[PDB]
Design a protein around this ligand. Structure first.
Ligand code: MN
Ligand code: MN
Lengths: 389, 391
């Protein structure tokens, strides 16, 4: 059975994130990792998802694209479905079996959280949270965290960590220091002459190393201890991690599914009739959605699907190569139709289909191999599948 | 067999591009001595990747451009670092898809370089992203300085960074490379913009030997419009183990130089000058030297990142030094006066041997404090002394 973990980071931190995830996975099978992000490319998710699945888990691309949306942590209950989830920062390393941490009862607590810097900071450290997702959702904790941040964000040193403290004061149980061992405090410890911090044993290795502060181990120069450990995981090939688990008979089939069809549309509108439904309904079809300008969030968010490539600011000749490379044109876009498409559809004799509300006004029913009901799009799903061999 | 010289140039921010480019090269070509011109790539990366290149009969050379004698123009300094008579320069925004022997073995004669044309002929001159360089002649004819002087003169009235200058100076003096050895597939947006339709009829089966993803439209961005996006990602996401296992099956497998340290040495400095530290690091690869300061460090010291066996710790603090001193075998009191008390306090307290050069002793705590004072003019004695503390 699957244990739920969540990270949040943009593509600029993909090296840290991937590493955090590598360490985690090294020592823990059956992980359903949810990754909140905005800009991480989809080829990365396709490949890493294969590995997670092979270890009896999964990888969920949670796109924070839309006006309703770094304070990504806040949105955890909007994406995560299980009752309990572990949030983890990306500037950190997992050194062993986290069973205890996973299997811990929160009771009526909103979350479990370790103290800031071994007792030196106020409150708890936000970098490891065993979260009661059921209660975060069913108590509207997301919107509460949002509204608390509008009301006073300046009056609070330390970002969303201070806000999570300010809301959950005395409403959290507490994790031991080794499940969020803030080795990155070293520079601050040394700064404030906290001599006994350097006396804490680093053998055996703490279960979670959290390299807080600006003094990061992956930088050129770092003064903090355990710099060498981050690099062990960062430079570890995924095949090392996997062969460990395929040595101890923990091996599952992936879903590296290949496409049985290549579909394309060119749009000059945010609205592409049933594109989301068609995407989820046809995993085996790569949809190519092209534009000549910037795209609105409703389309950019299609990055969440493994099987949809989106092309903002393309050009006619690039569209043309896609049409050549395609099996089927889907005439789904609403407002102004762009002529270049019909041109290329005729030119390379490409079949075309549409919905009753997305047909061209300045065109005729022989141009379409079928016109399908936009309120019964499963009929379009069956039509599309009929072009597969 | 023997090694073919290759040089990349790029900073840490592009490490994902650099490493991918190096994976696609190594996937298809064994026995590569790779040089890499940079200022901020951490040593742990080099250490690990070096192991791989060597296992394939090659090597990886950290070419650190730290010091006022030197990054957008890193190419210029190729003939200061590279020692072979011929070297292949490569941009890091690119993929190698096969055997490059025809390129490596090409005779330049008296040509200073070989290059492919810019954008299939669309642009003026050659593209600077793949260069078969006559390094012997670049060195022997002071090309680095002329490139710097032609950049000093008329930098303001040229447009392509240092490709302009490269083309300005070598105009009518290079042999040509076929397009497939610098296939600028990244020109696709540009070729679509200016309606160069025939660009798009150039067949991409079989795959060009060198794909070069020029322009702001990169295949590794969230979105891009250019073709052959898939192939960059095929390499980026490939484990090094696949590359190595492919070679081992074709009987190409060399042992690595995995040196393991026999001693740990430390110094705290308040100056740029740490007596013989370069000499010492070179003579003593089996010794891990740790050089610490409480402030920024000068380039002479930051440059020590070139050695695989020296860690350098700018902006450290007393309690951090304390922990390095605890873990270490020997204190080398090499800094050039303005001795910081902390070192001597930690040295006594944890009962650490401490040696020095004749020109680098404290004036205060006299010659019983040092287990040996060695000659600064005969530093081979300090070397032999350091090894006598090994086990
Ligand atoms: Mn953090
Ligand atoms: Mn380039």
């Amino acid at each position: 059975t699957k244990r739920a973990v969540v990270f949040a980071g943009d593509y600029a931190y993909i090296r840290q994130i991937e590493t955090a995830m590598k360490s985690l996975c090294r020592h823990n099978s059956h992980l359903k990792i949810y990754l909140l992000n905005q800009d991480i490319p989809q080829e990365w998710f396709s490949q890493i998802r294969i590995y997670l699945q092979e270890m009896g888990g999964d990888l969920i691309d949670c796109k924070l694209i839309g006006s309703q949306f770094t304070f990504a942590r806040y949105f955890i209950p909007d994406f995560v479905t299980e009752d309990k989830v572990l949030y983890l920062d990306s500037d950190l390393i997992v050194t062993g079996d986290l069973t205890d941490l996973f299997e811990l009862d929160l009771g009526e607590n909103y979350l479990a959280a370790a103290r800031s810097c071994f007792g030196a900071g106020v409150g708890f450290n936000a970098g490891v949270l065993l979260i009661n997702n059921k209660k975060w959702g069913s108590e509207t904790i997301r919107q509460k965290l949002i509204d608390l941040t509008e009301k006073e964000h300046e009056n609070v040193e330390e970002g969303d960590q201070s806000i999570l403290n300010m809301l959950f004061k005395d409403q959290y149980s507490s994790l031991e220091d080794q499940y969020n061992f803030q080795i990155g405090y070293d520079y601050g410890a040394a700064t404030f002459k906290h001599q006994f911090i350097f006396d804490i044993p680093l053998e055996p290795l703490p279960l979670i190393l959290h390299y807080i502060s600006q003094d990061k181990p992956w930088n050129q120069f770092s003064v903090g201890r355990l710099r060498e450990v981050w690099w062990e995981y960062s430079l570890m090939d995924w095949s090392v991690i996997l062969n460990e688990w395929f040595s101890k008979s923990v091996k599952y089939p992936s879903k590296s599914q290949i496409f049985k069809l290549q579909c394309v549309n060119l749009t000059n509108s945010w609205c592409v009739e049933k594109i989301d439904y068609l995407a989820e309904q046809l995993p085996e079809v790569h949809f190519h959605i092209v534009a000549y300008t910037n795209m609105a969030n409703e389309l950019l968010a299609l990055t969440r699907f493994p099987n949809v490539t989106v092309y903002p600011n393309s050009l006619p000749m690039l569209l043309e190569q896609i049409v050549i490379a395609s099996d089927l044109y889907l005439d789904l876009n609403h407002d102004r139709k762009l002529e270049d498409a019909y041109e290329f559809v005729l030119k390379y004799k490409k079949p075309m289909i549409a919905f009753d509300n997305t047909c061209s006004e300045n065109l005729s029913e022989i141009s379409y191999e079928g016109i399908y009901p936009s309120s019964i799009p499963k009929k379009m799903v069956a039509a599309i599948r009929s072009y597969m061999r």
